C-alpha cells in the first residue's frame, strides 16, 4: 500500500510506503481520531521477535543482512535470551538504536540533525553517585560554551522492573515552584509537586522565582538520592529586548540547555528507563510556552502593561502583541550570549527539506501535526501547510509514569 | 469505549459517550493517524431515515409514540414506492441545523440553534436560484448586522438533475494570470475565474473583482448572474495606528457564504445548500492575506513597517501579522460589519464544548482546523483534548461541477 501527503502551498506530493513497517498502535481507529490527545517486564516469547525485527533493520543499515555476522549474532541473541531472559546490545548497536529513536520521534521538529548524536554509554553505572558523575560529563560536554552539541547517556536497561535506574526530575536543569499560602506561585508552576519532592528528600530551598532544581537519582530500583549540579555547569542567558530597555528589569532569564530526562527508549525490545537527551532550544519554547502559557511564567500582562498596549478589549491583539515581542527578546538574547538557539521559521523550513529527503531515501517521515507546528504564527510557517502521517516505529522514545506513583520505597 | 478528554490547563476532564453513535469512518485506523490530511440505493436509504427520524422524535420527546411510529410507516411507504422521501419542514430545519452541530471543524457552533433556514425546494430554474440567494444575501448581510442562515435548494434524485452553485463562496474575488507570470487578485480563484470568463464573464481584470454567480439548476448548463453591488457589504482596510496602511489598497466582504458543500440529511443529499456566518479575524488577515499562495502581502507591509527582514530571527514576518490583523478587526469593527476576534471565538468554544459535552455527551471537534492560525497556544483551544468523529447530518466535501458536468 501506498499513501500520499500534499503540501497544500507547494502542490508537492509525497508518497509514504514506510508506514507499512509500523507495528505499534496509535490511539485512533476507523471510528475516532485521538490525535490530539496528549497520552493516548518482557518475557522471552515477545523479546526474541523484537530482537529479531531490531537486529534485522541494524544489519541492513550497515549493507550486511543475511551476512555470517548477522546470522551469527542473532544466534547470540537468541541463546542469551532463552539462557539469562534478556540480552545485552553491542556498542554499535546501542548508537544505532538511540539515533533511530530520535529519527522516529514523530513530534520532534528538529530531526534534520538526527545523525548528529553524541551517545554516552552508562550501561556500567550502579549507584546514585555515578549517576551523577555521568549526568554532570554529558551537560557539560553539551553545554560546550554555549555552541550546544546534541547528546545522550543511557544507563542499565530495565531487568525484573524492580531495579529500575531512573531519573527523577523530568529535565536536567529546571526552576522550582512554589505554592505559597495565598494560592500564588513563586518560579514555575509546571515544577512544584517535583520541588515540594525535593524538599521533603532534604533540598534546603531558596524560595526564588529561578532556582536550579536538585537532581533526584535513583539506581538500581534504591531510593533516589539528592545532587547539585555544580553552578558553573549551568548555563544561563538573561532576558534582554533589543528596542525596550524596559524588559531586563522584567528580572527573566531562562537555561541554555533543554535537557529531557524523564522518557524511556525501547531498542529491540529492552527498555532504557534513564537516558536523559538534550539538544538545544527552538525560541517559542521558552517565550510562548514556558514565558506566557497561563500555567507557566504567565508574563502577558507585565508585558502589555509595560508596551502601554490596549488591554480593555481582546481585539486589540494586545496578547498577540505582546508575544511577539517577548520571543524576540529571547531569540535577542540567546544570539547575544552566542547560545545556540533556532527560531521557528528557520526550524520548521529545516523540518519541511529533512521529510522530503527522508521520503525520498527511507520511504517517508512519520510526523504529528499537532505537535510539529508552532505555537505562535502557524500559518507563515511552512509546516501548518504540510500534510503528515503520523504512525510509531521502533526503536522509539517513550512516556513512562511518574516514578513517585510507582516506586517501593525502601526506607 | 468511555472516553475522557483533558483541558492540560485548566485540568477539566470530560467524558464522551456520543462517539459511540457515529458511524461514519475518519480517515485513521490503528496504525496511522490521518489528522492532517484535507480530504480523507432503496436498500440504503430506510435505515439512514430511521437512524434520523429517531433522533428527530427524541428531540423533542417523541421518541416511541403514534405520531413516530407512523411517520417512519410513511416515510418506508414512500421509499418503497418513489424510491426516495420528502423531508417536513420541521425535519428540514433540524437536520441543517444538526448538520451544523456535527460539524467537527468549525468553531463557531455556539451558534448552532440561532440558524435561519431559507426552504428553497419548490426552486426550478437558474435565475429562480439567484433569486433565493440574493434574498439570502440580504437577509444574512442585515446592513452589517449579520445574521446566519442556509439556503437549501432540491435534493439529488437520479444524479443527472443536480442543483449546484459552481462558486465556492457566494461573495468572492477574481484571479488572473498575466503575461508578467504573477498573478493579479486572489490566487485561489484563477481557475473558476476563467471558466466564468469562457462562460461569457466580462472581468474588469482588477485586484479585487466580485464573481458572477454560476448556477446550475436541474443539472441543466450553469449561467452567470451579477450579484447587485448594493448587495455585497464590503469593508476598506485600514489602521488604528498607521496612516500608510490605507494606501495598501486592501479591502474585503462582510458575508462568508459557502456554496460548494453537501448537506446529507436522513440518507437524503442536498448539493446547493449555501450557509452563511460571519469572519473570525484570522481568516482574512492570517489566512487571506498572509498565506503565499493568496494574496501575500507580508513583505510589503514589512516594508512599509521598516522593519530588519534581513534575518528570520527579527521575527518580522510575526510582527507584521499581528498588524495586519489588527488592522482587519478595527476595520469590521469601525464600520459596525460584525467579526469576532480568535480570543473570543475560542473562549466561546471551550463553553459549547462544556454545553455539549453536559447536555449531549460529547462533541466532535478537529483540533487541526479549531486551533487559530495565529497565536494558537494562547488561545484556550490549544490546551483542549478533543475527539474527532464523524455524526450525521452533515456537511460533506463533493467533487467540483467542472469536473462532473456532462455540457
Ligand atoms: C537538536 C535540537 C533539537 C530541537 C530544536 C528539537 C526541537 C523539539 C521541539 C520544539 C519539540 C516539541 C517540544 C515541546 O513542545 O515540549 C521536540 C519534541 C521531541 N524531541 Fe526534539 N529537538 C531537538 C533534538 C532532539 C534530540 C537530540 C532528541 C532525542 C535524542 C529529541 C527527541 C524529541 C522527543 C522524544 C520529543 C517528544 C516529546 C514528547 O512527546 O513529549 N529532540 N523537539
Ligand atoms: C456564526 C459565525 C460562524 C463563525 C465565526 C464560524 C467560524 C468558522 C471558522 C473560522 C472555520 C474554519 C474555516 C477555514 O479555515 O477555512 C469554520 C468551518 C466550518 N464551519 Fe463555521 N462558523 C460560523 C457559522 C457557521 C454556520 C452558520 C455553518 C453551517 C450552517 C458552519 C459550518 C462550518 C463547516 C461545515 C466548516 C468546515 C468546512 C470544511 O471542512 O472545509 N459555520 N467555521
Ligand atoms: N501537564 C502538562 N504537560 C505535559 C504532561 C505530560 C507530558 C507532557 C509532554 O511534554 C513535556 C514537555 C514539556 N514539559 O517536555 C519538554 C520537551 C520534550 C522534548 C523536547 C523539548 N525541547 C527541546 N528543544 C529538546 C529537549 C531535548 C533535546 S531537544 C522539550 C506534557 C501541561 C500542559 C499545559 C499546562 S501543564
Ligand atoms: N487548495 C487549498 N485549499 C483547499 C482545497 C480544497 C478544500 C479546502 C477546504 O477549505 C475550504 C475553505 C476555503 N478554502 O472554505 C471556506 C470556509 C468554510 C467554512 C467556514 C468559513 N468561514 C466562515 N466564517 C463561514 C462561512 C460560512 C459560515 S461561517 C470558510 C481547501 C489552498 C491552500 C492554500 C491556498 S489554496
Ligand atoms: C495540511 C493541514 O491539514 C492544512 O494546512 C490545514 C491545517 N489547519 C487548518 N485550519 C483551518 N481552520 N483551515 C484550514 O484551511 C486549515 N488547513
Ligand atoms: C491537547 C493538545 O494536544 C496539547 O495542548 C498539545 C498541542 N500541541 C503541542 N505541541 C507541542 N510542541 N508541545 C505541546 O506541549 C503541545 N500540546
Ligand atoms: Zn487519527
Known amino acids: 500500500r501506498f499513501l500520499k501527503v500534499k503540501n497544500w502551498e507547494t502542490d508537492v506530493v509525497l508518497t509514504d510506503t514506510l508506514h507499512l513497517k509500523s507495528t505499534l498502535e496509535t490511539g485512533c481507529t476507523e471510528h ?6 496528549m497520552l493516548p517486564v518482557r518475557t522471552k516469547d515477545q523479546l526474541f521477535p523484537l530482537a529479531k525485527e531490531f537486529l534485522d533493520q541494524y544489519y541492513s543499515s550497515i549493507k550486511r543482512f543475511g551476512s555470517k555476522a548477522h546470522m551469527d549474532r542473532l544466534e547470540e541473541v537468541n ?23 530520535w529519527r522516529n520521534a514523530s513530534r520532534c521538529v528538529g530531526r534534520i540533525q538526527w545523525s548528529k548524536l553524541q551517545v554516552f554509554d552508562a550501561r556500567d553505572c550502579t549507584t546514585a553517585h555515578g549517576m551523577f558523575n555521568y549526568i554532570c560529563n554529558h551537560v557539560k560536554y553539551a553545554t560546550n560554551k554555549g555552541n550546544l552539541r546534541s547528546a545522550i547517556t543511557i544507563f542499565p536497561q530495565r531487568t525484573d522492573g524492580k531495579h529500575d535506574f531512573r531519573v527523577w526530575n523530568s529535565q536536567l536543569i529546571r526552576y522550582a515552584g512554589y505554592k505559597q499560602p495565598d494560592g500564588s506561585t513563586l518560579g514555575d508552576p509546571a515544577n512544584v509537586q517535583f520541588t515540594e519532592i525535593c524538599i521533603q528528600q532534604g533540598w534546603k530551598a531558596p524560595r526564588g522565582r529561578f532556582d536550579v532544581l536538585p537532581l533526584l537519582l535513583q ?56 537516558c ?14 514556558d514565558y506566557c502559557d497561563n500555567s507557566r511564567y504567565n508574563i502577558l500582562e507585565e508585558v502589555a502593561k509595560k508596551m502601554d498596549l490596549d488591554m480593555r478589549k481582546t481585539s486589540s491583539l494586545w496578547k498577540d502583541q505582546a508575544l511577539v515581542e517577548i520571543n524576540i527578546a529571547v531569540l535577542y538574547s540567546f544570539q547575544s550570549d552566542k547560545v ?12 519541511i527539506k529533512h521529510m522530503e529527503n527522508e521520503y525520498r531515501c527511507r520511504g517517508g517521515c512519520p510526523a504529528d501535526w499537532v505537535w510539529i507546528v508552532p505555537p505562535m504564527s502557524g500559518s507563515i510557517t511552512p509546516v501548518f501547510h504540510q500534510e503528515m502521517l503520523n504512525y510509531r516505529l521502533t526503536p522509539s522514545f517513550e512516556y513512562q509514569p511518574d516514578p513517585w506513583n510507582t516506586h517501593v520505597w525502601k526506607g
Open 32 to 37: 475516532i481520531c485521538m490525535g490530539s490527545i
Open 219 to 274: 539506581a538500581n530500583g534504591n531510593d533516589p538520592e539528592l545532587f547539585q549540579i555544580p553552578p558553573e555547569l549551568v548555563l544561563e542567558v538573561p532576558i534582554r529586548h533589543p528596542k525596550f530597555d524596559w524588559f531586563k528589569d522584567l528580572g527573566l532569564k531562562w537555561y541554555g540547555l533543554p535537557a529531557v530526562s524523564n522518557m524511556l527508549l525501547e531498542i529491540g525490545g529492552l527498555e532504557f528507563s534513564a
Open 340 to 351: 545556540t538557539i533556532v527560531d521557528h521559521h528557520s526550524a520548521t523550513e529545516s523540518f
Open 276 to 289: 536523559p537527551f538534550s539538544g538545544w532550544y527552538m525560541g517559542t519554547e521558552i517565550g510562548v510556552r
Open 79 to 101: 541463546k542469551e535470551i532463552e539462557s539469562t531472559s534478556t540480552y545485552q546490545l553491542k556498542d554499535t548497536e546501542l548508537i544505532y538504536g538511540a539515533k533511530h529513536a
